[PDB]
Amino acid sequence: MSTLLALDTSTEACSVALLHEGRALSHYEVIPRLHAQRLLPMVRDLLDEAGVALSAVDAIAFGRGPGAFTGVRIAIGVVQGLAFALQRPVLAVSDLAILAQRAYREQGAERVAAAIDARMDEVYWGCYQLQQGEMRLAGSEAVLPPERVAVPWDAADWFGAGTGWGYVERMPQRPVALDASLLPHAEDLLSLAGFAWARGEGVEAEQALPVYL
Amino acid sequence: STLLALDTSTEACSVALLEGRALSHYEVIPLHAQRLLPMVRDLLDEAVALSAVDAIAFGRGPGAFTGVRIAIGVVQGLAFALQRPVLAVSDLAILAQRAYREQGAERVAAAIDARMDEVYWGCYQLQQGEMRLAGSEAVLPPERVAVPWDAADWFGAGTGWGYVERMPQRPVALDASLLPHAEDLLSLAGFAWARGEGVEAEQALPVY
Amino acid sequence: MSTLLALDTSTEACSVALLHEGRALSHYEVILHAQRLLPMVRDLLDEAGVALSAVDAIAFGRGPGAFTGVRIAIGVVQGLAFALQRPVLAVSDLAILAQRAYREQGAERVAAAIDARMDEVYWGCYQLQQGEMRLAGSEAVLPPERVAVPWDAAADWFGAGTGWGYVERMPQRPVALDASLLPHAEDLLSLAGFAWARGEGVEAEQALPVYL
Amino acid sequence: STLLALDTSTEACSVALLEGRALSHYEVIPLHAQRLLPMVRDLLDEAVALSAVDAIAFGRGPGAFTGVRIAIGVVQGLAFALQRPVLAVSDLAILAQRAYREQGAERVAAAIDARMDEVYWGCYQLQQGEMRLAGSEAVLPPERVAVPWDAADWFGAGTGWGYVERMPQRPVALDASLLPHAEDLLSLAGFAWARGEGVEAEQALPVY
Amino acid sequence: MSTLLALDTSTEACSVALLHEGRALSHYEVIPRLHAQRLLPMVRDLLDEAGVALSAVDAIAFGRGPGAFTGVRIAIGVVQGLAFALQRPVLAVSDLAILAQRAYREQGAERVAAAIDARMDEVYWGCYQLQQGEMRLAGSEAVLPPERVAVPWDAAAADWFGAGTGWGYVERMPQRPVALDASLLPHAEDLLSLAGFAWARGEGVEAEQALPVYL
Amino acid sequence: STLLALDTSTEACSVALLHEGRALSHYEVIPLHAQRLLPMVRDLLDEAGVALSAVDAIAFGRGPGAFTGVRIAIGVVQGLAFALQRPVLAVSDLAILAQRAYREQGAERVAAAIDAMDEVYWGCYQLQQGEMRLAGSEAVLPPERVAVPWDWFGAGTGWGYVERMPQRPVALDASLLPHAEDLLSLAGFAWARGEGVEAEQALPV
């Protein structure tokens, strides 16, 4: 039924995805910070390949951060512009959540501690737990030095996801399994956006905003 | 009486008002020093004069260190210039009252996520119309957390319940995503105002 | 009939402006633009009672200026322009200063300087040609000591922009200067007028910042 | 005109007021949500009606993340209920004006200590009666700090000058212990008010 | 009979051109994109549009500057890489000459003083005069403060045109022409015209050889 | 797989080839890259008895490093790949340093640094199955702000600004530059994972 567009430029990965008639399509490229250069062309190519008009889009999902300061904000701008002009709602979704949901798609983890490298020798951190198909946040998200990091579980199997885990040796807990290369991917944003769209969580374009931690 | 209710203690930003009618505005976005005042103005006009307000209620915390303090400063300012009293209410209590209104929970163990791998903890039991603190509020690791009832049927409300697995006891049902809501603060303020609990603007302060 | 929307967030100023049926409206506020720019755009179209569908091109400040601020404008403009299928008009923020200084003080020769990161200034010199401040030479990012005008030693010229807080380290200085001017969308719009008239518009995808 | 001036951006807590007379109250203690409002009341009475105030000035920062925000919230509240405009002023500028009034410095490199081993940096030059920003304010490591004058005679004011040894240039004289003072904010507000720079209570916000 | 590919990325403009069987074809695009993105796609599009295979190219011309020494560097590398792989000669051509050839094509000017803005209060300077359809340098190019630039013809009696961004400095120059165009930029089509004259003289350098480009 | 690898990221100029599982390399320090790179490619090719048409993919140092030298190697690579119709492999110069310092000094973990005005290019790498993989993220920072993600080596031009790092290492080489053989190593890893891209998309950091 619902046609949803998903954009993420919060990290080194620039990706875009489209839900249309139950089918999901994605483009994903890693570049460094040429995002402004490549985000629209990608939307254009995806719509073109799918044969979907932009007017067909019911809502635009975006990675709201945390991640790169300028990166995140490029996504925000494009999305703001698109949704205001179309007069459609937007869905803000955490990049830590996107990480979590990807680790669930690719590695089958149901309990993920998402961590993203951050400026000034901290990392962004949020732990997620599968609930009815959706990785949902457990506790709160934060920017912490890797030393002060902690899980909300006890004996439980969990996964370390994201480039924050480059700091694993400096961190209290080590998980049974881990992936420190993993980036937010728009395909997974699209899944999360679906759950949010089902609960009707969409907002006006003016409120498409980045997070502060 | 006409009462005004503000809360910025969590991700949630919320304002509410009580002539005899009761209205609420609730927006989840982390910024609070930007959207608070507008929400006030939007509500006063879409319902009423500001100088008609007899008292102002607020979340005193616990919660976000800066968040609670923004609401306090606003309330401190509003009330001083108006020369009206204020109504200090706990955010754990608001959660309690919310879980009552929403799911009919008469016994609510409220837990809000705190810094440094801890939770703010408070247990509330429905007395007359109101959730009321059973014992005292604390800041604890999740493994040291405890309830004052026998385990009876009780509810877990708030973000602190992300740590449920690490706690020594779990309720039948719980909502890990509940946040303090200004409507519920307003209910709680009714009880406090009717009991003459108001204080002068200066004494409006966050909890420690 | 050409209707032009103009956005600028390159510096602490956030401004929008509209050109419709030979009329020019503009708002300007000095204060996180991501919160403010789009609401301003809304209020403005409302105040002029115009619809976004009417707009033929969107003009923007392409920098130089704040790295992230420029990018916020570029992102919104890209997004508006793509959904609307309209072309975009890139205009320099140094040019906008020059155009403002001409409007506000009659200066026909303006050395625009915007304070840049790491003890440098963005520098560009402009002179009036048929009512448009046009670039004379190149824009650059320079230490203030290495800054130079393309004109003969005082006709008079004017120093415009926050780069002029460095006037004492510069090898020369004008008779008059305003180190407090910021880009203003009304001037962006005047400039846009000229660029639209020469068909300088480009696809939404190409709305990008400059690097100096 | 009658103007009110608050600042809680540093350790210092300070309030000041301008009928034609000018009075100041200044106390150094780290708490601000407690002593601010009283200082307001003490000053209004030992001099004047609150509803007589035409505008309110405040330190917008930089400084203490929570500190600045407490003053903002107070000012946001006061001004809204009074329905008067507000006057945003930088704390680095206040330092500049203070070092002028106190030691006669016409060129002041203001530096306030910041988190994460950095300093807030702003250079000010006396123009007409007022210190005015030369270039822009920044948050820098002390080794990257730079002045916009030739080295002429200039002054270093504020806590950021604890890091002087790590900076690439040092002035003839400096005061590492200066803090923003409400008197000086009030001077700076005069210039801003006379230029019609006031804004509506909501737009009162801290700097980033 | 000769097939030449031409590209220029020395300024804000990216342009590409092709001589094939006596016909010229060119695309010119002015954009803020970094060239690295757009130069190859433009080459691709032009070849496909003309129906010419890369392997049919006899030689490749490029503007060797002066100009933005980022876009010039891009050009030097692409062309050297394309030519190393094809094993075909390279034809370095001055951007000051390209301007002259352009002012001649567009404006009819047979004597052109090309000037391009340079770093640090200087301009790149070169004077050009028509010979047999080709604008030809007289006598060398320099990077000079604007007060020292000079023309080799009589500044007043002769008819000459000023071309390029350096003419921003015209007030500081010891002479000026009746007409100038300080916005004029290099165009690959005029690079092509000049490449043909150079090719016809047996110019052309293997990619391996030291390139007559001094940056 | 026949792989060709090029670096002019810094002052050093180097090229390498992997043909028939043999790895060959030419290294030369010369402050002149738009002049010596292609000769080096041709010489190395002769010495391997390989024709450029044999090559399946072309690796290059994408930076960071000297802005001129990087932009030329990028351009050369794009040109080669467009004409041969071959994919390209972008590899960080900081990773290349880290791979060199492993091969040469045995270092199982490296903190690569390259001088940029004031700031220096920073990246920390760890060995994982013979490949020096990035730990956190690469960054441009002033020398003082530099952090580490952890018996660890310090590599590159940027370790000349050692004082107030704040951390000093076990051992270090402040004159270590990127080397094509180590770019080659890293490329083989990238190749094997299907990381190749179009010539069009070869771009610097």
Ligand code: NA
């Ligand atoms: Na980090």
Ligand code: NA
């Ligand atoms: Na500067």
Ligand code: NA
């Ligand atoms: Na060009």
Ligand code: NA
């Ligand atoms: Na010049």
